[PDB]
């Protein structure tokens, strides 16, 4: 099989900036390269056939090149409806292969994150069970840390990050935090509280109540 | 233009079996030949199958190969993905995709895919928590333990778009989380009322829960 191996993984270029991608293959495949970008939940699309040969409804500043095991493609003034991912594809010998992928995120302004903090609902309590959680939004970069401490403690056992793309708006970040410990290690434990380290401030930002 | 449209996807338990799907539109679909490719978040694209234009070559991967049967109707212009044999690895979104060869070769056209899902888990709708606080604020909602996914969550039937954060579920116990934030000025609450819409079409669900001052 043809090792198809693709470089950079990710790129945090900004606006305008050269976008260089490559690809090799562990076998000379000729001009058989293909490359497809792919924006959040949506199938790929085609974008550079076999020859290099640039598809029809496809800007002009998506060019292709290279012939047997080294391969290039290249963004030159990236816009930011270029924000995606990039894979290509080898195609003269089955079975077909991708390079893993290529992710954009747009090189932007830093932005310093709005934490939100919200303490367990009655409901969810009623069930047996308690859950308090923590909002972070519109940041930059997503490089952050949550830091969660029960009653002046410091407890990381039970927590759930999830961590929303890049906004396609104001191209920031933002992610929760939730903590959930049954209702009865919760109430009785005092000071839950939800602390942050992100390159915008150099103090703990913290957010927190009290039962 | 050229159209396909994958269906079928579904939840199994592994070892199970299913069938997938594609509606060929818009071209001649007896001169191109087929495919079906599938994406998992762990491991990008991979090729799953192929089948020339006539239909009596198919090819597949080694690590499919006896497991997966590709086939089509030329008469229907539809495509088809047997499987059996299902395992975890499998559970990926598949994508049915156009050759522009009348064999093989690159891939011009994509539907727009099926998800498929391979566990040991039951449909299970959520539970939703509504989460209030104790120049605007900002309200929440939790969408814990339900299986599987897709979940889709809205806030006021869509009514507030702006601010909306919805967070990628999470898998913690063998069951999915999510959870959802909304920002709205400080004088729209708790005067007009907010309230997070839940459904969850896999258990014929949808829940709709208010924000209230706690
Ligand atoms: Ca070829």
């Known amino acids: 099989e043809t090792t198809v191996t693709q470089s950079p993984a990710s790129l945090s270029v900004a606006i305008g900036e050269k976008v260089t991608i490559r690809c090799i293959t562990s076998?000379?495949?000729?001009?058989?390269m293909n490359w497809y970008q792919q924006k959040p939940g949506e199938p790929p699309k085609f974008f550079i056939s076999?020859?290099?040969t640039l598809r029809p409804g496809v800007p002009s500043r998506f060019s292709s090149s290279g012939y047997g095991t080294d391969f290039v493609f290249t963004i030159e003034n990236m816009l930011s409806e270029d924000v995606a991912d990039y894979y290509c594809?080898?195609?003269?010998?089955?079975?077909?292969?991708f390079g893993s992928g290529t992710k954009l995120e747009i090189k932007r302004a830093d932005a310093a994150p709005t934490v939100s903090i919200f303490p367990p609902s009655s409901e969810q309590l009623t069930s047996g069970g308690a859950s308090v959680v923590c909002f972070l939004n519109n940041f930059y970069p997503k490089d952050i840390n949550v830091k969660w401490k029960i009653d002046g403690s410091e407890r990381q056992n039970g927590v759930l990050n999830s961590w929303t793309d890049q906004d396609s708006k104001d191209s920031t970040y933002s992610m929760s935090s939730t903590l959930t410990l049954t209702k009865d290690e919760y109430e009785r434990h005092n000071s839950y509280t939800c602390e942050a380290t992100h390159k915008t401030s150099t103090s703990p930002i913290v957010k927190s109540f009290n039962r | 233009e050229v159209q396909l449209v994958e269906s079928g996807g579904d939840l199994v338990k592994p070892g199970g079996s299913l069938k997938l799907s594609c509606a060929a539109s818009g071209f001649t679909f007896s001169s191109y030949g087929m495919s079906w490719v599938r994406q998992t978040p762990d491991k990008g694209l991979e090729w799953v199958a192929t089948?020339?234009?006539?239909?009596?070559?198919?090819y597949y991967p080694d690590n499919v190969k006896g497991r997966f049967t590709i086939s089509r109707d030329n008469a229907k212009n539809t495509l088809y993905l047997q499987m059996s044999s299902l395992k975890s690895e499998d559970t990926a979104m598949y994508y049915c995709a156009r050759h522009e060869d009348g064999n093989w070769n690159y891939f011009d056209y994509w539907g727009q895919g099926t998800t498929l899902t391979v566990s040991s888990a039951k449909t299970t709708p959520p539970s939703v928590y509504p989460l209030a606080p104790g120049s605007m604020v900002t309200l929440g909602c939790l969408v814990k333990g339900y299986f599987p996914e897709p979940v889709t969550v809205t806030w006021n039937s869509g009514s507030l778009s702006s601010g909306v954060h919805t967070f990628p579920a999470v898998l913690q116990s063998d069951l999915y989380t999510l959870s959802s934030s909304v920002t709205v000025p400080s004088s729209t609450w708790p005067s007009e009322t907010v309230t997070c819409n839940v459904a969850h079409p896999a258990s014929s669900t949808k829940v709709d829960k208010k924000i209230v001052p706690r």
């Open positions: 594809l080898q195609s003269d010998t089955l079975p077909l292969t």
């Open positions: 089948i020339s234009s006539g239909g009596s070559y198919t």
């Open positions: 076999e020859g290099n």
């Open positions: 076998t000379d495949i000729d001009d058989d």
